């Protein structure tokens, strides 16, 4: 029984017998845990027209959908084509690596 991140990574890679249902439940937990205010800091630090801006805004929208309608957002994730779900999860795992911390905080200067 892996944790949230391990379950999601397993689903992306089609290993450890993780089902789409378990992945979407775990994804909902990850979206709850992620701090959307910190993602907005990352987004605002991008140069304008950076393709990352759209990614950050997608994860931000999914956090808001998950916060309003938890179980419907899980169903929405289950309805997504597998390849679209996996891209959304991968982007969300990437943001998790960038913002998880015990904090107020700033954004790094390197590029």
Curated annotation (Swiss-Prot):
Site (Involved in RNA-binding): give the residues: 20, 79
Q: Which GO terms describe its cellular component?
A: host cell cytoplasm; host cell nucleus; virion component
Q: Where is this region: Binding to the phosphoprotein?
A: 54-91
Question: Which cysteines bridge via disulfide bonds?
Answer: none
Reported modifications of this chain: Phosphorylated by host in infected cells. Only dephosphorylated M2-1 is competent for viral mRNA binding. Cyclic turnover of phosphorylation-dephosphorylation of M2-1 is required for efficient viral transcription.
Q: Which GO terms describe its molecular function?
A: RNA binding; structural constituent of virion; zinc ion binding
Chief localisation class: virion
Location within or outside the cell: Virion; Host cytoplasm; Host nucleus
Keywords in alphabetical order = Activation of host NF-kappa-B by virus, Elongation factor, Host cytoplasm, Host nucleus, Host-virus interaction, Metal-binding, Phosphoprotein, Protein biosynthesis, RNA-binding, Transcription, Transcription antitermination, Transcription regulation, Viral matrix protein, Viral transcription, Virion, Zinc, Zinc-finger
Which residue ranges are recorded for the region named Globular core? 4-99
Gene Ontology biological-process entries: regulation of viral transcription; symbiont-mediated activation of host NF-kappaB cascade; transcription antitermination; viral transcription
* Stretches assigned to coiled coil: none
Q: What is the annotated role of this protein in its UniProt record?
A: Acts as a tetrameric transcription processivity factor that binds in a competitive manner to RNA and the phosphoprotein (P) to prevent premature termination during transcription. Transcription anti-terminator that enhances readthrough of intergenic junctions during viral transcription. Preferentially binds to poly(A)-rich sequences. Plays a role in the association of the matrix protein with the nucleocapsid, which initiates assembly and budding. Also, can activate host NF-kappa-B through association with host RELA.
Q: What does its UniProt record remark on the domains?
A: Contains a zinc-finger domain on its N-terminus essential for its anti-termination function. Contains an oligomerization domain. The central globular core is responsible for binding to RNA and phosphoprotein.
Subunit text: Homotetramer. The homotetramer interacts with RNA. Interacts with the phosphoprotein (P); this interaction is required for protein M2-1 function, localization in host inclusion bodies. Formation of a complex host PP1/M2-1/P allows P to target host PP1 phosphatase to the M2-1 substrate. Interacts with the nucleoprotein (N). Interacts with the matrix protein (M); this interaction directs M localization to cytoplasmic inclusions comprising viral proteins L, N, P, and M2-1 and mediates M association with the nucleocapsid. Interacts with host RELA. Interacts with host PABPC1 (via C-terminus).
The record's family statement is: Belongs to the pneumoviridae M2-1 protein family.
According to UniProt, the name of this protein is Protein M2-1
């Amino acid at each position: 029984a892996l944790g949230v991140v391990g379950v999601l990574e397993s689903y992306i890679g089609s290993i450890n017998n993780i089902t789409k249902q378990s992945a979407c439940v775990a994804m909902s937990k990850l979206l709850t845990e992620l701090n959307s205010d910190d993602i907005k800091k990352l987004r605002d630090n991008e140069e304008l027209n950076s393709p990352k801006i759209r990614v950050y805004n997608t994860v931000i929208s999914y956090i808001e959908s998950n916060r309003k309608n938890n179980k419907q957002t899980i169903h929405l994730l289950k309805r997504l084509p597998a390849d679209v779900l996996k891209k959304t999860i991968k982007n969300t795992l990437d943001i998790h690596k960038s913002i998880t911390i015990n904090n107020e905080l700033t954004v790094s200067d390197t590029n």
